[PDB]
Design an enzyme around this catalytic site. Structure first.
Site, PDB file in Angstrom:
ATOM      1  N   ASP A 125      37.772 102.807  84.791  1.00  0.00           N
ATOM      2  CA  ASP A 125      37.372 104.182  84.996  1.00  0.00           C
ATOM      3  C   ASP A 125      38.686 105.011  85.079  1.00  0.00           C
ATOM      4  O   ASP A 125      39.746 104.464  85.504  1.00  0.00           O
ATOM      5  CB  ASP A 125      36.510 104.397  86.247  1.00  0.00           C
ATOM      6  N   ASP A 153      35.391 103.750  91.016  1.00  0.00           N
ATOM      7  CA  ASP A 153      35.389 104.336  92.353  1.00  0.00           C
ATOM      8  C   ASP A 153      34.169 105.159  92.771  1.00  0.00           C
ATOM      9  O   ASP A 153      33.727 105.057  93.918  1.00  0.00           O
ATOM     10  CB  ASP A 153      36.615 105.240  92.510  1.00  0.00           C
ATOM     11  N   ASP A 161      29.935 104.698  88.572  1.00  0.00           N
ATOM     12  CA  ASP A 161      30.366 103.348  88.267  1.00  0.00           C
ATOM     13  C   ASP A 161      29.459 102.299  88.889  1.00  0.00           C
ATOM     14  O   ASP A 161      29.616 101.114  88.581  1.00  0.00           O
ATOM     15  CB  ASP A 161      31.805 103.126  88.743  1.00  0.00           C
TER      16      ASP A 161
HETATM   17 MG   LIG Z   1      35.851 107.864  89.097  1.00  0.00          MG
END
Ligand SMILES: [Mg+2]
Ligand SMILES: *[C@@H]1O[C@H](CO[C@@H]2O[C@@H](C)[C@@H](O)[C@@H](O)[C@@H]2O)[C@@H](O[C@@H]2O[C@H](CO)[C@@H](O[C@@H]3O[C@H](CO[C@H]4O[C@H](CO)[C@@H](O)[C@H](O)[C@@H]4O)[C@@H](O)[C@H](O[C@H]4O[C@H](CO)[C@@H](O)[C@H](O)[C@@H]4O)[C@@H]3O)[C@H](O)[C@H]2NC(C)=O)[C@H](O)[C@H]1NC(C)=O
Ligand SMILES: CCCCCCCC/C=C\CCCCCCCC(=O)OC[C@H](COP(=O)(O)OCC[N+](C)(C)C)OC(=O)CCCCCCC/C=C\CCCCCCCC
Ligand SMILES: CCCCCCCC/C=C\CCCCCCCC(=O)OC[C@H](COP(=O)(O)OCC[N+](C)(C)C)OC(=O)CCCCCCC/C=C\CCCCCCCC
Ligand SMILES: CCCCCCCC/C=C\CCCCCCCC(=O)OC[C@H](COP(=O)(O)OCC[N+](C)(C)C)OC(=O)CCCCCCC/C=C\CCCCCCCC
Ligand SMILES: CCCCCCCC/C=C\CCCCCCCC(=O)OC[C@H](COP(=O)(O)OCC[N+](C)(C)C)OC(=O)CCCCCCC/C=C\CCCCCCCC
Ligand SMILES: CCCCCCCC/C=C\CCCCCCCC(=O)OC[C@H](COP(=O)(O)OCC[N+](C)(C)C)OC(=O)CCCCCCC/C=C\CCCCCCCC
Ligand SMILES: CCCCCCCC/C=C\CCCCCCCC(=O)OC[C@H](COP(=O)(O)OCC[N+](C)(C)C)OC(=O)CCCCCCC/C=C\CCCCCCCC
Ligand SMILES: CCCCCCCC/C=C\CCCCCCCC(=O)OC[C@H](COP(=O)(O)OCC[N+](C)(C)C)OC(=O)CCCCCCC/C=C\CCCCCCCC
Ligand SMILES: CCCCCCCC/C=C\CCCCCCCC(=O)OC[C@H](COP(=O)(O)OCC[N+](C)(C)C)OC(=O)CCCCCCC/C=C\CCCCCCCC
Ligand SMILES: C[C@@H]1O[C@@H](O[C@H]2C[C@@H](O)[C@]3(CO)[C@H]4[C@H](O)C[C@]5(C)[C@@H](C6=CC(=O)OC6)CC[C@]5(O)[C@@H]4CC[C@]3(O)C2)[C@H](O)[C@H](O)[C@H]1O
Ligand SMILES: *[C@@H]1O[C@H](CO)[C@@H](O[C@@H]2O[C@H](CO)[C@@H](O)[C@H](O)[C@H]2NC(C)=O)[C@H](O)[C@H]1NC(C)=O
Ligand SMILES: CC(C)CCC[C@@H](C)[C@H]1CC[C@H]2[C@@H]3CC=C4C[C@@H](O)CC[C@]4(C)[C@H]3CC[C@]12C
Ligand SMILES: CC(C)CCC[C@@H](C)[C@H]1CC[C@H]2[C@@H]3CC=C4C[C@@H](O)CC[C@]4(C)[C@H]3CC[C@]12C
Ligand SMILES: [Mg+2]
Ligand SMILES: [Mg+2]
Lengths: 993, 40, 294
Positions: free
Chosen positions: A346, A687, A691
Site C-alpha cells: 500500500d 495500514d 487494506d
Molecule cells: Mg493506507
C-alpha cells in the site's frame, strides 16, 4: 451476510438534489428532525455503531490446540495402543502393560503440546488488547431547530448534523452547506491530501464527489452541515468490516508441508504393517497375534517427539521477532514471509509517511534538497547564505499556524500543528533548522495581513523590521509561482539584488517543471522593503485599498513539498527485489503521485518505461506502440473495473513493475486473488481499512502498528509495532533460516526410527530374544533425543540466504524421497547394525553364542522352563536369562546414543563441511554432553533395575558402537564432498535433501 | 584355587555404580560450564 | 496423476525414473548393503576370536543355583483326578522324558562312564578345563536308585492311586562345588539327623502354618537313601569337556495327601554357596501346588 452483494463496488444516491434527498429520507433542511421522530427511528433500525466482533471463548481455542494434523496422528496412535491392550487382556492371562504405558504417554504429549502452543497465542492476544484505546465520542445534531451534542450511538438517518474542524464525521452524511471545509479521506479512500467537501456534486464515483462525508473521517479545517444518509453497519466502512470478518482464513504453507509429511509417514507405516501381517500368517502364527503385530508396527512408525520438537522450533524463531518489534498472532505465520514471492504493498501510510514535508527548495539559481526522514538522518542543505535567512523570515512570518499547546516533549516532526498541511510543513522546516519560530515571530510584529483570496491567489502581510538600525517596514507574500513571478522584477542572488532578465526567468521555469515533475507541490516566496519615507512608522495600512506595491517585489525562491517515504523503505524494497520478490504497488491514490513514489522507492526501476512515456518520447499516438516493449505499467482503477480474468493474468504475466492506481478495496482483493490464481504466495502490507479485505485474503497480512487502523490490525496476521519496514526483510530471512533447520532436525529424529524397529522385525522373523524393549525406546524418542533436535534450530546459514531465488512450491518440498533414502535407508541402517553388534556381544560374553540364539524365543520366553542350556552346557533359570536380556536393552540404548553423536554432527550441515562451518553452536555441544550424562544416569543409579529395568554395564561394552559412529561420520563427509565438487550430479539428485 | 574358588562368581557392582555416577556428574557439570560460558 | 506417475510414454519413465535410473540406484544399494554386511560380519568374527570354548567368561548371573523338578506344571500346580486317566498324562509324559535319559543302555562301557562309590563321597577333580586329556569321565547314575518313582515298576510313577512323585534337580553350573552346612550349633532343626558331610540336603515343607497337618509323610529317595545330592557328581566340566554327563536326582513321594484340597508345598536346599531370592522363586527352592482331586 450475502457476500456477492458485499463484494460489489459501492453504489449511492449522491447524484440527487437537496429536495430529493430531504424527500427520500424525510427532513427539514433548516429545522432538522423532531425529537419524537428521532427516537422513533432510533428504535426502528439500530444505533450508529459497528457490530462487535464474534467473541472467541478460551475453551474453544484450547480444544483447537488439542487437535490439528500432527496431534491427531498422535491421538489415533494412543487409541490404537489401548485397543491392542484390550485384546491382550481379554485373550491372554498376565497381559503385559507396555501398550497402556505407551498410550497414556502419547496422550500426555498431545496435551502438553497443546498447553504450550495455547499459552503463546494468548500472550500475543494480551499485548494486543493493550492497544484498543476507545474514548467515547459525541456528535452535534440539530433537532427542532436547536443544537445539541449527543453520544455517537444516538445519531439516526435523517437528522441534521454539523461538524467543525477537529471533529469526526459521525455517519455517512450528505453535505448541504459548507464553509471552506476539508476532510482527511486517507483511511477509507487513501487520499493523502485534504479533499474539500462542497455541497455541489462533481464525480459519478461516490468516493470522489465532495457532497458526501464519510464514517471515521475527520474534518481538518472548516465547518459544514449535512443530512445523515447512511447509519450503523450499513455504512461504507461497515460493509467493508463485515466483508473482512466474512472471508475465509486459508491454510499456510508450513501446514501443507506437515500434512504431506504425515502422508508419507503413514504410507510407509501401513505398508510395513500389512506386509508383515501376511508374512506372519505365512509363518504359522495365529490371527490374534498378527493383529497385535500390525498395530505394533504401525504405532512404532509414529514420531511421538517430533511434535514437541517442531513446536519448540517454531516458537524459538518467534521470540527473535518479538525482540525487534515484529509480533505474530498465530505461530506458523513466522514461516510464510520467507516463502513469499510477490509482495502487494500500500502507498499511503505503508510505503509513505502520510505527513506533508518540505522536500526541495529553490534559491540562488540552484535546487537544494532537504532531509525528509522521520529520525532526521541525512544531509543538511548548506545554511550559510543570506538568501536562506531571508527565506526563513518569509515562510516563518507569512504563516498563521502554530504548534499545539503542550508539545514541549515530542520531537519537531511528530508534534501536533493547528492549520493547513502546507503552513504546517513550512513551520516544521523553519523550526527544524532555524530554531524556535515563536521567538522568530515575536521578534517581528505583524501589522496587517490580507488573507488568501480566491482571486488574488496569494497570502501577504506586513510586519516591523527587527533591525535596530532600520525602522522600516517589511512586506512578505507567498503564493503560486506563476502569480508571484508576474509580480517581481528583482531577484535576491547570494544576498545582493539583481534584475529579472529572461535568463533567470527561464531558469525559474525549468526549476518549476523540475519540482513539478517530481510529483511535488511548489510555492513561491517574495518580500520587499517598504520605503519608510512614503509609509512612515506611524501610518496604518488598513486592508482596503492599494497600500502596498503589488508588483516590483523581490522574489527570493520557490519551496516545494510532498509526503516522503519512511526511512528504510527504499533499502527494504531493494532487499526484497534482490531476493527475487516481485513488488507490486496497489493503492487507491492518484496515479500521478503513485508513479512518482513507485520510482522513488524502487518499484519502477529507473530506466524502465510505460507505453505513454514512449508515446511522449516519440510524439506519436499511444495506439501504435507495442505493449511488449514496456516493462512497467500503471493500471488505473477505472480501467480495472472493465477487465476480464485473462487480461489481469496477462497484466501480471508480462509486466514486471506493476502499479495499480485508483483501485478500490474490493479491487485490491481482486488483485490479490489474481496473484494467487497462478500459484505464488502473497504478502499484503497495509495500514487503513481499505487494506482489510486485502490483508485477510493474502497468504500473509502485515499491518502497521502506529499508523494502522483497528480493523486492518485485527484482520492481519503480523503486526509492525514500530512501523519499521526493514522488519519485513528480517522476517523473510528468518522464514528461510528456520526452514532448512526443520529439514535437518526431521532427518535426525527419523534416522533413529530404523534401529528402533529392526530389533522387533528380526525378533519375529529370526526368533531371537527381544533386542530393544519398550521403556528404552521411550527413553530414546522422548528423552536424550529432544535436546539435540531442539539445538539443530540454532544453526546459522551456510551460503547467503538472501541471495537464492524463492523456493518453488510445486517442486521443492519439505520432506522428499531424498531424505527418506538417507534416514531410513543409509544412516539408520548402520545404527541398527551397531545396535545388533553390541547385542550379540553381550549375549556371547555371558554364554549364548550366535549359533544357539536362532530358534530359542519359544523357550527363552516360556515362564516355566527353569533349565535353558546355553552354548557351553550351563543351565539358566527364567529370571536369570531375563536379567541378561534387560542388560542388552540398556546397552542397545547406549549404542543408539553413540551413533546419534555422529548423526547430530552429520545433520548439522547439509552441504558444507564441518571444518568450514564450525562447531560454534554451544547448544549442540551441550546436547551431546547431556545426552551422555542421562544414559549413564539411567543405568548406574540404584533401583533402576527395579523401577525401569535397566542394569549396569561393564566398561568394555560401552565401546562396541564407536566404530559404527566413526564410519557414519566418514561416509557422510565424503557424501558432502562430491556434491560440492560435482554440482548437479548423481549424489545431488539422489542424496541432497 | 580349587574348592574355595568363590571369587569366580563375584563382581563388584557397587564400585562400578559409584564410579559411573561420579563420571555422569562430571559430564553434567562440564556441560553446564560450556552452556553458561559467555553470559558472564 | 494416477496414470501418468505410473507410466508416461514421452520421457519413457516408469514410476518416475527411466530404465537406466532404476539400475543405477539398485546397483548402488546392492554395493552399499553388501559392504555393510561384510563389515558387520568382520566385526562379529573378531568377537568369536575373543571367547573360549571351554568356559563362559562371565558366570555371575548364574551364581546361586536353581532347583527345578520333573513335572511340567503350568502355574506350579499339579491337579489331577484319580479316576480319569487322561488327566495326569501331561505329567507322566514329562517325568518319563526326564528319566528316559538315565537308561542303563545309555550308560555302558568304560568310556566315557565310570563306576563311583555307591555311598555319598567327596568331590572328584578330573584336572583342569583343558583339551590336554581327552573327554573327561562322568559318574554313572542308576534309575533304580530312585525306588518307588522310576517308571520301571509303576510306569505312571504314583499318579495312579493318589501318591505322586516329584523328581527334583540341581541346576548344572560349570566349576561349581556344592558346599553343605557344617555341624556347629547353628543349623536348622531338620538337618541335624543324618549329617553326611558329603550330601547336599533337600527338605520339603508347607508354606503356611495351617497346611502342615494336611500334608502327610514326605518320603525322599536318593543316592545312599539320603535326601540330598552326593558331592561326588561335581563339578561339571561343561558340555564340550564332558558330553554324556548325568546330574544327580532326588525323588520325593507325597504319600498320605489329603483329598480334594489345594496344598502349597515349598522344597528347599541348604548350603553355603546357596542363597535364595525374593524375586526369583526357583533360586535354591521351588513351590508346587498339589491337588489330588478324586
Ligand atoms: Mg493506507
Ligand atoms: C529307556 O527305557 C524305556 C523302557 O525300557 C523298558 O524297560 C527297560 C527296563 C528294559 O527292560 C527295556 O528293554 C524295556 O523296553 C524305553 O521305552 C519303551 O520302549 C518300548 C518300545 O517302543 C515300548 O514298548 C511299546 O509299548 C506299547 C504300549 O505302551 C503302553 O505303555 C506305555 C508306558 O509303558 C504308555 O506310554 C503307552 O501309551 C501304552 O499305554 C506297545 O503298544 C508297543 O507295541 C509295539 O511292540 C509290539 C511287540 O511288543 C508290536 O507288536 C507292535 O506292532 C509295536 O511295534 C510296544 O510294546 C515301551 O512302552 C517303552 N516304555 C515306556 C515306559 O514308555 C525307552 O525307549 C528307553 N529310552 C532310551 C533312550 O533308551
Ligand atoms: C526383517 C527385515 C527388516 C526389514 C526392514 C524394512 C525397513 C523399511 C525401510 C524403508 C521403507 C521403504 C518403503 C518405500 C519408501 C519410498 C519413499 C516414497 O514413497 O516417497 C514418496 C515419493 C514422493 O516424493 P516427492 O514428494 O519428491 O515427489 C514429487 C513428485 N512431483 C514433484 C513430480 C509431483 O514417491 C516416490 O518416490 C515414488 C514411489 C516409489 C516407490 C518405490 C518402491 C520400491 C520399494 C521396494 C523395492 C524392492 C525391490 C527389491 C528387488 C531389487 C531387484 C534385485
Ligand atoms: C573412535 C571414536 C569415534 C567417535 C565418532 C563420533 C565423533 C563425534 C564427536 C566429535 C567429533 C569432533 C569433530 C572435530 C571437528 C573440529 C573442526 C574444527 O575445529 O574446525 C575449525 C573451526 C573453523 O573456524 P573458522 O575458520 O570458521 O573461524 C573463523 C573465526 N573468525 C571469524 C574470527 C575469523 O573452528 C571452530 O569451529 C571454532 C572452535 C570450535 C572448537 C570445537 C571444540 C569442541 C569439539 C568437540 C566437542 C566434543 C564432543 C564430545 C562428545 C562426547 C560427550 C561425552
Ligand atoms: C539444571 C537442573 C539440574 C537438575 C539435575 C537433577 C538430577 C537428579 C539426579 C539424581 C536423582 C535421581 C532420583 C534418585 C532415586 C533414588 C532411588 C534410591 O535411592 O533407591 C534406593 C532403593 C534401593 O534399595 P535396595 O538396594 O535395598 O533394593 C533392593 C531391591 N531388590 C533386592 C528387591 C532387587 O530404592 C528402592 O528400593 C526403590 C527404588 C525407587 C525408584 C526411584 C527411581 C525413580 C524412577 C524414574 C525417575 C527418573 C527420571 C529421569 C529424570 C532425569 C532428570 C535429569
Ligand atoms: C528433561 C529430560 C527428561 C529425562 C527423563 C526421561 C524420560 C522418560 C520417558 C519415558 C519413561 C516412562 C515410562 C514409565 C514406566 C513405568 C513402568 C511401570 O509402571 O512398571 C510397573 C512395575 C511393575 O513391575 P513388575 O510387574 O515386574 O512387578 C512385579 C512385582 N512382584 C513380582 C514382586 C509382585 O512397577 C514398578 O516398577 C513400581 C515402581 C514404580 C516406578 C515408576 C517410575 C516412573 C518413571 C517416570 C515417570 C515420570 C517421567 C516424567 C518425565 C518426562 C520427561 C519429559
Ligand atoms: C574432544 C572431546 C574431548 C571429550 C573429553 C570428555 C572427557 C572424558 C571424561 C572421562 C573419561 C576418563 C575415564 C577414566 C575412568 C577410569 C576409571 C577406572 O579405574 O577404570 C577401570 C576400567 C577397567 O575395568 P575392568 O573391567 O578391567 O575392571 C573392573 C574391576 N572391578 C569391576 C572388579 C572393579 O577401565 C576403564 O573403564 C577405561 C576407561 C576408558 C579409557 C579412556 C579412553 C580414552 C579414549 C580416547 C581419548 C584419546 C585422547 C588422545 C589425546 C590426543 C591429544 C591431541
Ligand atoms: C581409522 C582412521 C582414523 C583416521 C584419523 C584421521 C584424522 C585426520 C585429522 C584431521 C583431518 C585434516 C583436517 C582437514 C582440514 C581441511 C581444511 C580445508 O580447507 O578443508 C576444505 C575441504 C573442502 O573443500 P571443497 O573444495 O569441497 O570446498 C568447496 C567450498 N565451496 C562449496 C564454497 C565451493 O575440506 C575437506 O576436504 C574435508 C574432507 C575431510 C574428510 C576426512 C574425514 C577424516 C575422518 C575423521 C577425522 C577425525 C575426527 C574425529 C576424531 C575421532 C577421534 C577418535
Ligand atoms: C559399518 C557401516 C560401514 C558403511 C561403509 C559404507 C561404504 C560404502 C560406500 C560407497 C559404496 C557405494 C558405491 C556405489 C558405486 C555405484 C554407483 C553408480 O553406478 O554411480 C554412477 C554414477 C556415474 O553417473 P553420472 O553421475 O556420470 O551420470 C549422470 C546421471 N544423473 C543425471 C542421473 C546424475 O557415479 C557417480 O556419480 C559417482 C558417485 C559414487 C558414490 C561415491 C560415494 C562414496 C561414499 C562412501 C565411501 C567412503 C567410505 C569411508 C569408509 C571408511 C571406513 C573406515
Ligand atoms: C552447578 C554444579 C552442579 C554440581 C552438582 C554435583 C552433584 C553431585 C555429583 C555426584 C554425586 C555422586 C554420588 C555417588 C553415589 C554413590 C551411590 C552408590 O554407589 O550406591 C550403590 C549402592 C547400591 O549397590 P547394590 O549392591 O544395590 O548393587 C546391585 C548389586 N546386585 C544387583 C548385583 C545385587 O547404594 C546403596 O546401597 C545405597 C544407595 C542410597 C541412595 C544414594 C542416591 C544416589 C542417587 C543419585 C545421585 C547421583 C547424581 C549424580 C549427578 C548425575 C547428573 C545427571
Ligand atoms: C509372540 C508373542 O511375543 C510376546 O508379545 C510380543 C507382542 C506384545 O505382547 C508386546 C507387548 O504388548 C510388544 C507390543 O505389541 C509392541 C511394542 C510396544 C513395540 C513398540 C515400541 C514402540 O515404541 O511403539 C510400539 C515394539 C515391541 C513392543 O515394545 C512390545 C514388546 C513386548 C511384547 O510382549 C512382544 C509375548 O510373549 C506373547 O505371549 C507372544 O505370543
Ligand atoms: C494318614 O492320614 C490319616 C488321616 O487322613 C491318618 O489316619 C487317621 O488317624 C486318625 C487317628 O489319629 C483316625 O481317627 C482316622 O480314622 C484315620 N484315618 C484314616 C483314613 O486312616 C493316618 O495315620 C496317616 N498316616 C500317615 C502315615 O501319616
Ligand atoms: C569426542 C570423543 C572422541 C570422546 C569419546 C568419549 C568416550 C570414549 C567416553 C564418554 C563417556 C565415557 C564412559 C562414561 C562412563 C563410564 C563408566 C565407568 O565406570 C568406566 C568408564 C566409562 C565406560 C567411560 C568410558 C569412556 C567414555 C565412553
Ligand atoms: C571394507 C569392506 C568392503 C571389507 C569387507 C570385508 C569382508 C568381505 C570380509 C571381512 C571379514 C571376512 C570374514 C572373516 C572371517 C571369516 C571366517 C572363515 O572361516 C570364512 C571366511 C569369513 C566368513 C570371512 C569372509 C569375508 C569377510 C566378511
Ligand atoms: Mg490471514
Ligand atoms: Mg520413535
Amino acid at each position: 451476510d450475502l457476500d456477492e452483494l458485499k463484494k460489489e463496488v459501492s453504489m449511492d444516491d449522491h447524484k440527487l438534489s437537496l429536495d430529493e434527498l430531504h424527500n427520500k429520507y424525510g427532513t427539514d433542511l433548516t429545522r432538522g428532525l423532531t425529537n419524537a421522530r428521532a427516537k422513533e427511528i432510533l428504535a426502528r433500525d439500530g444505533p450508529n455503531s459497528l457490530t462487535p466482533p464474534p467473541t472467541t471463548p478460551e475453551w474453544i481455542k484450547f480444544c483447537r490446540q488439542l487437535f490439528g494434523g500432527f496431534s491427531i496422528l498422535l491421538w489415533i496412535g494412543a487409541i490404537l495402543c489401548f485397543l491392542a491392550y484390550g485384546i491382550q487382556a481379554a485373550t491372554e492371562d498376565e497381559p503385559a502393560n507396555d501398550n497402556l504405558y505407551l498410550g497414556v504417554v502419547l496422550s500426555t504429549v498431545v496435551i502438553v503440546t497443546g498447553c504450550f502452543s495455547y499459552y503463546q497465542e494468548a500472550k500475543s492476544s494480551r499485548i494486543m488488547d493493550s492497544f484498543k484505546n476507545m474514548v467515547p465520542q459525541q456528535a452535534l445534531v440539530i433537532r427542532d431547530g436547536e443544537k445539541s451534542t449527543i453520544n455517537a450511538e444516538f445519531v439516526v438517518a435523517g437528522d441534521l448534523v454539523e461538524v467543525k474542524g477537529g471533529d469526526r464525521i459521525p455517519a455517512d452524511l450528505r453535505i448541504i452547506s459548507a464553509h471552506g471545509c476539508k476532510v482527511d479521506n486517507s483511511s477509507l479512500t487513501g487520499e493523502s491530501e485534504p479533499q474539500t467537501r462542497s455541497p455541489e456534486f462533481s464525480s459519478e464515483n461516490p468516493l470522489e464527489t465532495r457532497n458526501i462525508a464519510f464514517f471515521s473521517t475527520n474534518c481538518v479545517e472548516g465547518t459544514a452541515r449535512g443530512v445523515v444518509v447512511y447509519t450503523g453497519d450499513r455504512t461504507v466502512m461497515g460493509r467493508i468490516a463485515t466483508l473482512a470478518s466474512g472471508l475465509e482464513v486459508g491454510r499456510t504453507p508450513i501446514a501443507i508441508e506437515i500434512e504431506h509429511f504425515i502422508h508419507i509417514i503413514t504410507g510407509v507405516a501401513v505398508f510395513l504393517g500389512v506386509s508383515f501381517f501376511i508374512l506372519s500368517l505365512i509363518l504359522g502364527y495365529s490371527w490374534l497375534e498378527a493383529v497385535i503385530f500390525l498395530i505394533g508396527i504401525i504405532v512404532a512408525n509414529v514420531p511421538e517427539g517430533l511434535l514437541a520438537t517442531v513446536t519448540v522450533c517454531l516458537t524459538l524463531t518467534a521470540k527473535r521477532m518479538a525482540r525487534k518489534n515484529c509480533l505474530v498472532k498465530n505461530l506458523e505465520a513466522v514461516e510464510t514471509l520467507g516463502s513469499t514471492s510477490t509482495i502487494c504493498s500500500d502507498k499511503t501510510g505503508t510505503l509513505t509517511q502520510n505527513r506533508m514535508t518540505v522536500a526541495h527548495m529553490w534559491f540562488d539559481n540552484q535546487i537544494h534538497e532537504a532531509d525528509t526522514t522521520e529520525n532526521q538522518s541525512g544531509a543538511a542543505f548548506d545554511k550559510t547564505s543570506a538568501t536562506w535567512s531571508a527565506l526563513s523570515r518569509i515562510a516563518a512570518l507569512c504563516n498563521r499556524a502554530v504548534f499545539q499547546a503542550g508539545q514541549d516533549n515530542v520531537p519537531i516532526l511528530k508534534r501536533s500543528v493547528a492549520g493547513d498541511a502546507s503552513e504546517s510543513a513550512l513551520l516544521k522546516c523553519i523550526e527544524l533548522c532555524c530554531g524556535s519560530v515563536q521567538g522568530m515571530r515575536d521578534r517581528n510584529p505583524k501589522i496587517v495581513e490580507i488573507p488568501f483570496n480566491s482571486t488574488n491567489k496569494y497570502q501577504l502581510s506586513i510586519h516591523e523590521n527587527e533591525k535596530s538600525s532600520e525602522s522600516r517596514y517589511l512586506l512578505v507574500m507567498k503564493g503560486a509561482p506563476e502569480r508571484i513571478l508576474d509580480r517581481c522584477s528583482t531577484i535576491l542572488l547570494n544576498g545582493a539584488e539583481e534584475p529579472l532578465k529572461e535568463d533567470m526567468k527561464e531558469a525559474f521555469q525549468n526549476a518549476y517543471l523540475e519540482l513539478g515533475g517530481l510529483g511535488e507541490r511548489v510555492l513561491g516566496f517574495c518580500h520587499f522593503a517598504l520605503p519608510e519615507d512614503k509609509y512612515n512608522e506611524g501610518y496604518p495600512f488598513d486592508a482596503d485599498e492599494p497600500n502596498f506595491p503589488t508588483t516590483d517585489l523581490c522574489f527570493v525562491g520557490l519551496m516545494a513539498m510532498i509526503d516522503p517515504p519512511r526511512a528504510a523503505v527504499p533499502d527494504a524494497v531493494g532487499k526484497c527485489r534482490s531476493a527475487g520478490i516481485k513488488v507490486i504497488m496497489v493503492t487507491g491514490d492518484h496515479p500521478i503521485t503513485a508513479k512518482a513514489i513507485a520510482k522513488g522507492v524502487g518499484i519502477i526501476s529507473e530506466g524502465n518505461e510505460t507505453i505513454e512515456d514512449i508515446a511522449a518520447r516519440l510524439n506519436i499516438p499511444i495506439g501504435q506502440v507495442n505493449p511488449r516493449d514496456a516493462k512497467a505499467c500503471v493500471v488505473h482503477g477505472s480501467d480495472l473495473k472493465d477487465l476480464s480474468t485473462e487480461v489481469l493474468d496477462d497484466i501480471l504475466h508480462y509486466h514486471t513493475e506493476i502499479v495499480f492506481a485508483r483501485t478500490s478495496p474490493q479491487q485490491k482483493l481482486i488483485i490479490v486473488e489474481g496473484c494467487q490464481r497462478q500459484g505464488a504466495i502473497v504478502a499484503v502490507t497495509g495500514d487503513g481499512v481499505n487494506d482489510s479485505p486485502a490483508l485477510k485474503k493474502a497468504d500473509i497480512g502485515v499491518a502497521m502498528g502506529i499508523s494502522g487502523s483497528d480493523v486492518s490490525k485485527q484482520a492481519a496476521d503480523m503486526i509492525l509495532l514500530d512501523d519499521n519496514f526493514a522488519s519485513i526483510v528480517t522476517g523473510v530471512e528468518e522464514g528461510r533460516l528456520i526452514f532448512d533447520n526443520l529439514k535437518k532436525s526431521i532427518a535426525y529424529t527419523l534416522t533413529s526410527n530404523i534401529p528402533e524397529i529392526t530389533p522387533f522385525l528380526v525378533f519375529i522373523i529370526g526368533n531371537v530374544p527381544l533386542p530393544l524393549g519398550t521403556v528404552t525406546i521411550l527413553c530414546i524418542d522422548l528423552g536424550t533425543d529432544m535436546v539435540p533436535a531442539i539445538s539443530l534450530a540454532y544453526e546459522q546459514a551456510e551460503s547467503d540466504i538472501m541471495k537464492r531465488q524463492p523456493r518453488n512450491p510445486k517442486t521443492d518440498k519439505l520432506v522428499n524421497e531424498r531424505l527418506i533414502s538417507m534416514a531410513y535407508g543409509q544412516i539408520g541402517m548402520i545404527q541398527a547394525l551397531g545396535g545388533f553388534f553390541s547385542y550379540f556381544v553381550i549375549l556371547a560374553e555371558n554364554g549364548f553364542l550366535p549359533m544357539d540364539l536362532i530358534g530359542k524365543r519359544v523357550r527363552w520366553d516360556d515362564r516355566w522352563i527353569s533349565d535353558v542350556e546355553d552354548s557351553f552346557g550351563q543351565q539358566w533359570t527364567y529370571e536369570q536369562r531375563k536379567i541378561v536380556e534387560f542388560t542388552c536393552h540398556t546397552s542397545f540404548f547406549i549404542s543408539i546414543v553413540v551413533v546419534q553423536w555422529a548423526d547430530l554432527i552429520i545433520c548439522k550441515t547439509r552441504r558444507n563441511s564441518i571444518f568450514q562451518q564450525g562447531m560454534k553452536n554451544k547448544i549442540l555441544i551441550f546436547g551431546l554432553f547431556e545426552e551422555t550424562a542421562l544414559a549413564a544416569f539411567l543405568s548406574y543409579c540404584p533401583g533402576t533395575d527395579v523401577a525401569l529395568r535397566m542394569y549396569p554395564l561393564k566398561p568394555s561394552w560401552w565401546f562396541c558402537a564407536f566404530p559404527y559412529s566413526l564410519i557414519i561420520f566418514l561416509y557422510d563427509e565424503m557424501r558432502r564432498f562430491i556434491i560440492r565438487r560435482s554440482p548437479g550430479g548423481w549424489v545431488e539428485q539422489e542424496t541432497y535433501y | 584355587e580349587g574348592p574355595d574358588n568363590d571369587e569366580r562368581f563375584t563382581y563388584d557392582y557397587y564400585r562400578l555404580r559409584v564410579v559411573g555416577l561420579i563420571v555422569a556428574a562430571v559430564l553434567c557439570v562440564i556441560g553446564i560450564i560450556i552452556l553458561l560460558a559467555g553470559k558472564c | 496423476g494416477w496414470k501418468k506417475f505410473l507410466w508416461d510414454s514421452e520421457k519413457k519413465e516408469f514410476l518416475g525414473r527411466t530404465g537406466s535410473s532404476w539400475f543405477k540406484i539398485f546397483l548402488f544399494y546392492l554395493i552399499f548393503y553388501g559392504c555393510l554386511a561384510g563389515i558387520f560380519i568382520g566385526t562379529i568374527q573378531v568377537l568369536l576370536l575373543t571367547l573360549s570354548d571351554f568356559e563362559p567368561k562371565y558366570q555371575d548371573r548364574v551364581a546361586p543355583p536353581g532347583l527345578s523338578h520333573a513335572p511340567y506344571a503350568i502355574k506350579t500346580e499339579i491337579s489331577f483326578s484319580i479316576s480319569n486317566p487322561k488327566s495326569y498324562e501331561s505329567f507322566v509324559k514329562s517325568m518319563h522324558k526326564l528319566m528316559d535319559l538315565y537308561n542303563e543302555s545309555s550308560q555302558a562301557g568304560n568310556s566315557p562312564f565310570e563306576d563311583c562309590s555307591d555311598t555319598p563321597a567327596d568331590y572328584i577333580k578330573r584336572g583342569d578345563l583343558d583339551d590336554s586329556q581327552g573327554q573327561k569321565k562322568a559318574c554313572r547314575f542308576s534309575r533304580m536308585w530312585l525306588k518307588n518313582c522310576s517308571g520301571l515298576d509303576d510306569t505312571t510313577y504314583g499318579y495312579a492311586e493318589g501318591k505322586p512323585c516329584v523328581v527334583a534337580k540341581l541346576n548344572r553350573i560349570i566349576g561349581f562345588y556344592p558346599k553343605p552346612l557344617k555341624n556347629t550349633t547353628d543349623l536348622p532343626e531338620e538337618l541335624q539327623a543324618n549329617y553326611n558331610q558329603y550330601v547336599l540336603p533337600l527338605r520339603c515343607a508347607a508354606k503356611r502354618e495351617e497346611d502342615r497337618e494336611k500334608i502327610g509323610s514326605i518320603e525322599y529317595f536318593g543316592l545312599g537313601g539320603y535326601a540330598g545330592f552326593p558331592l561326588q557328581y561335581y563339578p561339571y566340566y561343561g558340555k564340550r569337556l564332558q558330553k554324556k554327563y548325568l546330574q544327580p536326582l532326588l525323588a520325593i513321594q507325597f504319600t498320605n495327601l489329603t483329598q480334594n484340597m489345594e496344598l502349597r508345598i515349598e522344597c528347599k536346599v541348604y548350603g553355603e554357596n546357596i542363597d535364595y531370592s525374593e524375586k526369583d522363586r526357583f533360586r535354591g527352592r521351588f513351590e508346587v501346588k498339589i491337588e489330588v482331586k478324586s
